[PDB]
Design an enzyme around this catalytic site. Structure first.
Site, PDB file in Angstrom:
ATOM      1  N   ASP A 130     -68.097  55.169 -52.498  1.00  0.00           N
ATOM      2  CA  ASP A 130     -68.640  55.819 -53.711  1.00  0.00           C
ATOM      3  C   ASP A 130     -68.011  57.187 -53.953  1.00  0.00           C
ATOM      4  O   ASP A 130     -67.869  57.603 -55.094  1.00  0.00           O
ATOM      5  CB  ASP A 130     -70.164  55.956 -53.658  1.00  0.00           C
ATOM      6  CG  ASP A 130     -70.884  54.614 -53.835  1.00  0.00           C
ATOM      7  OD1 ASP A 130     -70.299  53.678 -54.416  1.00  0.00           O
ATOM      8  OD2 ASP A 130     -72.036  54.493 -53.379  1.00  0.00           O
ATOM      9  N   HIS A 153     -62.291  43.879 -70.133  1.00  0.00           N
ATOM     10  CA  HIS A 153     -62.130  44.197 -68.729  1.00  0.00           C
ATOM     11  C   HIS A 153     -63.097  43.383 -67.852  1.00  0.00           C
ATOM     12  O   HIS A 153     -62.689  42.832 -66.832  1.00  0.00           O
ATOM     13  CB  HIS A 153     -62.365  45.691 -68.519  1.00  0.00           C
ATOM     14  CG  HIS A 153     -62.119  46.149 -67.117  1.00  0.00           C
ATOM     15  ND1 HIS A 153     -60.894  46.618 -66.691  1.00  0.00           N
ATOM     16  CD2 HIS A 153     -62.949  46.226 -66.050  1.00  0.00           C
ATOM     17  CE1 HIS A 153     -60.987  46.977 -65.423  1.00  0.00           C
ATOM     18  NE2 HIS A 153     -62.219  46.733 -65.009  1.00  0.00           N
ATOM     19  N   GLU A 154     -64.375  43.322 -68.241  1.00  0.00           N
ATOM     20  CA  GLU A 154     -65.345  42.592 -67.417  1.00  0.00           C
ATOM     21  C   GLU A 154     -65.048  41.091 -67.427  1.00  0.00           C
ATOM     22  O   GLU A 154     -65.170  40.406 -66.403  1.00  0.00           O
ATOM     23  CB  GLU A 154     -66.782  42.857 -67.888  1.00  0.00           C
ATOM     24  CG  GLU A 154     -67.212  44.308 -67.808  1.00  0.00           C
ATOM     25  CD  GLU A 154     -66.914  44.971 -66.477  1.00  0.00           C
ATOM     26  OE1 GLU A 154     -66.990  44.324 -65.421  1.00  0.00           O
ATOM     27  OE2 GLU A 154     -66.616  46.176 -66.485  1.00  0.00           O
ATOM     28  N   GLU A 161     -58.745  45.934 -59.460  1.00  0.00           N
ATOM     29  CA  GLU A 161     -58.797  46.770 -60.661  1.00  0.00           C
ATOM     30  C   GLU A 161     -57.498  46.823 -61.442  1.00  0.00           C
ATOM     31  O   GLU A 161     -57.512  46.720 -62.673  1.00  0.00           O
ATOM     32  CB  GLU A 161     -59.305  48.177 -60.326  1.00  0.00           C
ATOM     33  CG  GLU A 161     -60.725  48.165 -59.778  1.00  0.00           C
ATOM     34  CD  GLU A 161     -61.700  47.408 -60.698  1.00  0.00           C
ATOM     35  OE1 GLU A 161     -61.434  47.285 -61.913  1.00  0.00           O
ATOM     36  OE2 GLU A 161     -62.735  46.938 -60.208  1.00  0.00           O
ATOM     37  N   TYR A 216     -57.343  51.845 -60.853  1.00  0.00           N
ATOM     38  CA  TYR A 216     -57.217  51.206 -62.185  1.00  0.00           C
ATOM     39  C   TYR A 216     -55.838  51.464 -62.803  1.00  0.00           C
ATOM     40  O   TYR A 216     -55.121  50.528 -63.159  1.00  0.00           O
ATOM     41  CB  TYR A 216     -58.283  51.728 -63.177  1.00  0.00           C
ATOM     42  CG  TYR A 216     -59.706  51.356 -62.823  1.00  0.00           C
ATOM     43  CD1 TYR A 216     -60.393  52.029 -61.795  1.00  0.00           C
ATOM     44  CD2 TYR A 216     -60.374  50.355 -63.521  1.00  0.00           C
ATOM     45  CE1 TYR A 216     -61.701  51.702 -61.475  1.00  0.00           C
ATOM     46  CE2 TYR A 216     -61.693  50.010 -63.202  1.00  0.00           C
ATOM     47  CZ  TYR A 216     -62.345  50.689 -62.178  1.00  0.00           C
ATOM     48  OH  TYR A 216     -63.633  50.357 -61.854  1.00  0.00           O
ATOM     49  N   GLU A 246     -68.825  43.403 -63.254  1.00  0.00           N
ATOM     50  CA  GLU A 246     -68.411  42.007 -63.479  1.00  0.00           C
ATOM     51  C   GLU A 246     -69.264  40.959 -62.748  1.00  0.00           C
ATOM     52  O   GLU A 246     -68.713  40.002 -62.175  1.00  0.00           O
ATOM     53  CB  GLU A 246     -66.949  41.849 -63.027  1.00  0.00           C
ATOM     54  CG  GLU A 246     -66.741  42.098 -61.514  1.00  0.00           C
ATOM     55  CD  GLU A 246     -66.292  43.511 -61.186  1.00  0.00           C
ATOM     56  OE1 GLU A 246     -66.697  44.474 -61.873  1.00  0.00           O
ATOM     57  OE2 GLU A 246     -65.526  43.654 -60.222  1.00  0.00           O
ATOM     58  N   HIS A 283     -62.176  40.205 -64.998  1.00  0.00           N
ATOM     59  CA  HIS A 283     -62.678  40.082 -63.608  1.00  0.00           C
ATOM     60  C   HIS A 283     -63.119  38.665 -63.164  1.00  0.00           C
ATOM     61  O   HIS A 283     -63.143  38.371 -61.963  1.00  0.00           O
ATOM     62  CB  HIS A 283     -63.858  41.026 -63.384  1.00  0.00           C
ATOM     63  CG  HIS A 283     -63.474  42.414 -62.985  1.00  0.00           C
ATOM     64  ND1 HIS A 283     -62.627  42.677 -61.928  1.00  0.00           N
ATOM     65  CD2 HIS A 283     -63.867  43.619 -63.464  1.00  0.00           C
ATOM     66  CE1 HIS A 283     -62.504  43.985 -61.782  1.00  0.00           C
ATOM     67  NE2 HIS A 283     -63.258  44.577 -62.692  1.00  0.00           N
TER      68      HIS A 283
HETATM   69 ZN   LIG Z   1     -63.039  46.630 -63.005  1.00  0.00          ZN
END
Ligand SMILES: [Zn+2]
Ligand SMILES: Nc1nc(-c2ccc(O)cc2)cs1
Ligand SMILES: Nc1nc(-c2ccc(O)cc2)cs1
Ligand SMILES: [Yb+3]
Length: 606
Positions: free
Chosen positions: A372, A292-293, A315, A380, A268, A296
């Site tokens: 990570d 979704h993006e 998220e 999510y 995003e 954001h």
């Molecule tokens: Zn996201």
């Protein structure tokens, strides 16, 4: 505090602005230049400050035209090395100075992928892209690499003149480089304060096409046409998002279609969303990733998680908004279909991690955990599940969207924790505190495993997927003849995907069933990346040797971790492909995205 940053916390000092002047050197795979940080002291008598760095070479630090003393600490693994700077003059509370740091990145910067010409579409020019989330900005420039600090930025980026630079900012012009006429300087301005994980850069042979009043799609020439079609719904999605979230404050909403190695479905980055080319299904069916993006731009970019322990705020609310956009475009039954699909995804993650695993908690303690390594669909979908459960508990979508808009308004331009969110939830719904007190907060927020309550889902669009899945699972050999291409005639691509998702949950199936599926449905011909992914996993886990070269190919020819990581895991778990999986990884290692390389290596135990 932010246990992922080694920098002075926001309670000590705050970066207000970054001015970045750098040059991109493809021959050396380095970015070189100066980061001028406008820093405001939050304390009396401040005499030094600490910044995050990772694999950065520091040449000098200049304040008020003079070089100042600085030192680099021991590397602390993935956190990098703290850089302490001795201030020339003690600062009062609220006093601002500009600190200009001359630096160079390492070719192995975990923030960057450098691609050779042969790794691109056009095969003539090299390509560079960044990915700072969560804590990789420190691998590009010295900064307080924490989402608790938000800054504006300006940049001038010098690149070979045949190439184009773009950033997460408004394009502010281009000129020849007066220092080098083989080069061009592209300029950028981001006037809305942002956390530094949203800083982004791409440099390559990029072309653009306009697809809406505030949207250009950018990519290599070969992908522009397909991309303009695939993402043609973008403006209508933005209009819906604005209705739900309030004003889009960012000016431009451009899209950048990255080469195949981009590790995520999207990122995003403000003014310039980055997307995987695996979205290019040919029918717009994977556009929820754009939704979704877009979402954001409110949840994440305006209201930001204060530390990465609270990433679900980013998220969960974004998936919540995304599903509303899709619900507005295609109907409430579809919003419910996607929601129920997301519950199934959460089932997978929990089953895969283990129901006592710390990474199935909604709020996690990331102290001494590489973010990570912790990344998954849990924040999510467990985040979404909580919000959808609350939606149902508190009076429905219209009412809960009222909370959502107020929440965005309240916390815009700020960084918050789960405590802040819960406080505002209780404030907005003070007339329903009795209801709110029936929520098991300890279980929802802090316990591993599946949520203590499953929301209510409409089943309408999902029934046919389940029906067909169950027909196959319960089929015996003498039943295989009954299946044929007409079974799929009334299924959308979304429904085909979910049929495969449902069946994959019960994998393995007998090898004869899987051979019959290919015989009657020709799933091998499907190019939709989501469907193809689930189909190939279904084949590998059911031990079909014929699928091995197809799975190996999909795993390596694109680099979206969602696909690549489980494909490699499945291939390593099949004895017939295990050695091939390991060998293929070792061969491709060097040319993979650095984060993906590391994670796939961990997954393969190599
Ligand atoms: Zn996201
Ligand atoms: N209550 C019930 N939920 C399901 C279900 C659960 C998860 C999915 O992804 C799809 C369907 C089947 S019966
Ligand atoms: N609720 C949960 N959030 C996470 C998480 C948090 C931050 C990251 O960067 C990646 C994953 C793991 S479980
Ligand atoms: Yb039978």
């Amino acid at each position: 505090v932010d246990t992922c940053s080694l920098a002075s916390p926001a309670s000590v000092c705050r970066t207000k602005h970054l001015h970045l002047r750098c040059s991109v050197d493809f021959t050396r795979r380095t970015l070189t230049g100066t980061a001028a940080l406008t820093v405001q002291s939050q304390e009396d008598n401040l005499r030094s400050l600490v910044l995050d760095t990772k694999d950065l070479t520091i040449e000098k630090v200049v304040i008020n035209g003079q070089e100042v003393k600085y030192a680099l600490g021991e590397r602390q693994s993935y956190k990098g090395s703290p850089m302490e700077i001795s201030l020339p003059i003690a600062l009062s509370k609220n006093q601002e100075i500009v600190i200009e740091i001359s630096f160079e990145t390492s070719p192995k910067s975990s923030a960057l992928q450098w691609l050779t010409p042969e790794q691109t579409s056009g095969k003539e020019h090299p390509y560079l892209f960044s990915q700072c989330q969560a804590i990789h900005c420190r691998a590009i420039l010295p900064c307080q690499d924490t989402p608790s600090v938000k800054l504006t930025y300006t940049a001038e980026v010098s690149v070979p003149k045949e190439l184009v630079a773009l950033m997460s900012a408004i394009r502010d012009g281009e000129t020849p480089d007066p220092e080098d006429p083989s080069r061009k300087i592209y300029k950028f301005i981001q006037k809305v304060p942002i956390p530094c994980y949203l800083i982004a850069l791409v440099v390559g042979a990029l072309e653009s096409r306009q697809i809406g009043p505030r949207t250009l799609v950018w990519s290599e020439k070969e992908q522009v046409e397909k991309s303009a079609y695939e993402f043609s719904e973008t403006e209508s999605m933005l209009k819906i998002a604005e209705d739900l979230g309030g004003p889009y404050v960012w000016g431009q909403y451009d899209l950048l279609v990255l080469p195949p190695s981009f590790p995520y479905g999207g990122m995003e980055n403000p003014c310039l969303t980055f997307v995987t080319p695996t979205l290019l299904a040919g029918d717009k069916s994977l556009s929820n990733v754009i939704a979704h993006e877009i979402s954001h731009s409110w949840t994440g970019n305006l209201v930001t998680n204060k530390t990465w322990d609270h990433f679900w705020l980013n998220e969960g609310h974004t998936v919540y908004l995304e599903r509303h956009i899709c619900g507005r475009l295609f109907g409430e039954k579809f919003r419910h279909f996607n929601a129920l699909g997301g519950w199934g995804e959460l089932q997978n993650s929990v089953k895969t991690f283990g129901e006592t695993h710390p990474f199935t908690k909604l709020v996690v303690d990331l102290t001494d955990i590489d973010p990570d390594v912790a990344y998954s669909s849990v924040p999510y979908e467990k985040g979404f599940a909580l919000l959808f459960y609350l939606e149902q508990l508190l009076g429905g979508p219209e009412i809960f969207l009222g909370f959502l808009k107020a929440y965005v308004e309240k916390f815009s331009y700020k960084s918050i924790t789960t405590d802040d969110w819960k406080d505002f939830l209780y404030s907005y719904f003070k007339d329903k505190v009795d209801v709110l007190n029936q929520v098991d907060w300890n279980a929802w927020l802090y316990s591993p495993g599946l949520p203590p309550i499953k929301p209510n889902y409409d089943m309408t669009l999902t029934n046919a997927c389940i029906a067909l899945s169950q027909r196959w699972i319960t089929a015996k050999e003498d039943d295989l003849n009954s299946f044929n291409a007409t079974d799929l005639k009334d299924l959308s691509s979304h429904q085909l995907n979910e049929f495969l998702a449902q069946t994959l949950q019960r994998a393995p199936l007998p090898l004869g069933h899987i051979k019959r599926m290919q015989e009657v449905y020709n799933f091998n011909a499907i190019n939709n990346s989501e469907i193809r992914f689930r189909w190939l996993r279904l084949c590998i886990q059911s031990k079909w040797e014929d699928a091995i070269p197809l799975a190996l190919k999909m795993a390596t020819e694109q680099g979206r971790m969602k696909f690549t990581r489980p494909l490699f895991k499945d291939l390593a778990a099949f004895d017939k492909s295990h050695d091939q999986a390991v060998r293929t990884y070792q061969e491709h290692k060097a040319s993979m995205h650095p984060v993906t390389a590391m994670l796939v290596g961990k997954d393969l135990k190599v």
